[PDB]
Symmetry: C3
Subunit: 222 residues, 3 copies
Amino acid sequence: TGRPEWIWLALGTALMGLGTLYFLVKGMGVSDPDAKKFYAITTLVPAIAFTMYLSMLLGYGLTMVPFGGEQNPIYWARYADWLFTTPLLLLDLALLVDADQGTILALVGADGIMIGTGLVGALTKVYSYRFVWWAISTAAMLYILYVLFFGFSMRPEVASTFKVLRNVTVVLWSAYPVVWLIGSEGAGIVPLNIETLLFMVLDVSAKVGFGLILLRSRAIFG
Amino acid sequence: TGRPEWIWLALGTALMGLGTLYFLVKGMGVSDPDAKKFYAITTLVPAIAFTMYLSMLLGYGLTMVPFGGEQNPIYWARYADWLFTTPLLLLDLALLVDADQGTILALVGADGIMIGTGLVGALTKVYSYRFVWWAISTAAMLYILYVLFFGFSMRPEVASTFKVLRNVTVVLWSAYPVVWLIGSEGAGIVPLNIETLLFMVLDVSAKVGFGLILLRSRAIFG
Amino acid sequence: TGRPEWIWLALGTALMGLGTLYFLVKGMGVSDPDAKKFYAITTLVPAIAFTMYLSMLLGYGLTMVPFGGEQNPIYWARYADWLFTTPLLLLDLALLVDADQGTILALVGADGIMIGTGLVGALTKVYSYRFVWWAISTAAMLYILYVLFFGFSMRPEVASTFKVLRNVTVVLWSAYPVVWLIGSEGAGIVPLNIETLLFMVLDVSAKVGFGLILLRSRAIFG
Ligand SMILES: *C/C=C(C)/C=C/C=C(C)/C=C/C1=C(C)CCCC1(C)C
Ligand SMILES: *C/C=C(C)/C=C/C=C(C)/C=C/C1=C(C)CCCC1(C)C
Ligand SMILES: *C/C=C(C)/C=C/C=C(C)/C=C/C1=C(C)CCCC1(C)C
């Protein structure tokens, strides 16, 4: 299409589609109820991302937001994705370590706040206020990372896989607020097409990369 | 009103209203926690459907979608209904057979995908792409039906009621993609008023019919 | 700002912000998984309310709804708040008394209905029909209050705290339909700025007041 970022939306669509079918095939067989849990969560994440990448690709998940006196192309479908996929990702971590329900409700709700205030910031028409919402969302993100490091003595295999995915998570998720801040939603330093490339690489790694690590682990079986 | 389909929206409103009050009365009494579960789920389904039928009846759940160069009347409130009532229906089936949580999360999330891509398809302004979303949604539907048949040795009474509702479910839910495809959201072969009649008959059967079968069964008690 | 109600939106923002940080600090320490549950729920409630008060304050959570041939300023962000915070409040009550899951699903779903039909009523452009949605929502509210009084012999300490919060809940929640009815969403008897003051006082009491009562109780510990 006439949108230079179309290629990264097409590649993301394809890669999420392929990871979904890979994980669906892979989880064929599985009878351990525990493993079943991780397969369901982990397959749903890129299936949802597939649909929202495709909706961006076809033009549906894009809207024009006037701010700084200009019509800014905002991809809102990313927040409908993340709204569901980022808690699912947290549930995978949480189940690995047998978290208490209170800690899981803390994580999912901080996550909701993170994404929803990101969305409000994305659609806010007063430029300066966009970054107030960014800050609040970032603070929710930092709470989540805090809990992942300080909020949890288990089978060695659980701990090891949990520690790797936790590290993957902090590194990748921490990049999203930066991208947003310097990209088209924020200061407009980085053009939309490079931004969309950046988010494609992060999303595939955080979903399909993460899930390959998890689902090859015997940490997921009782 | 000046909408010929108004009569089927009024009858659906009434029938869902009546089934809700019937099931509410009926579940009066119930102390078995298990039965309580099925009554809550099963009463909520047509109560939600009541509200969305009424919102269509009064004009609120209808929007104009330009496509094939025309203003197409799309009832979006059906997807707000289904978004909640179709997972609830799946939960009823799932609890009957004591499904593993992983299988329940698979079903609810495939269902979310089904309805949400149905909604995107319903509101898409590029005619051809409407049917890409239809296909993806249908494939989610076929996954759900697959799991209901191949994803689950229990008390004979559970199995029997489970098998009847499962059959009811596959037959009725399978008709929805057809109706959408030949009706006003899709190829426009069947006029909106007949379409609305068709969806009224399916919805009442899938909700109030289904629930009468379930809630008369002693399969719902421990 | 040029909106007279701005001061009560600023004070509500501040008070919800402060209660969130108070409860977050307070729950620092807590290891009892049960207590952890109540802290998560109870801290999330005013954190969510903080974000929606701030979105009203900045103008984002406000839209113009034409009815009775006039552009009525409707704060829709209250329903995005309540959609999540009112079930959370019910979950706090429900967990205190060890409710059956069927009763919890009844409460959360009646609550969803309550808020969602409130939202539909708030955005309905046919004046008379606004109050049909009000009535349906009120009837959901009365079901919830009914269940809180007649739907539940435990540790004396649980019962006592449960009875106080239950009383707090019925009194405060019952005022909301009245405010809506006489205020800008309804009959327009009470100006928007006084209405916004009223909702600020109720919300802070129902969230931050309620939570102070709960989280000082040893009813929350196993
Ligand atoms: C599947 C995609 C994932 C794991 C995406 C994660 C997204 C975030 C961690 C987003 C964070 C943001 C903030 C902390 C600040 C404001 C903007 C956001 C929403 C991009
Ligand atoms: C209470 C109403 C029920 C049980 C409705 C079920 C609706 C479906 C099974 C819808 C399926 C659709 C597709 C598979 C394709 C695209 C359009 C839909 C959403 C009508
Ligand atoms: C945190 C805020 C709380 C506890 C707010 C509760 C709101 C209600 C109980 C709202 C009830 C309403 C009706 C019963 C009728 C129509 C309008 C509503 C949504 C204001």
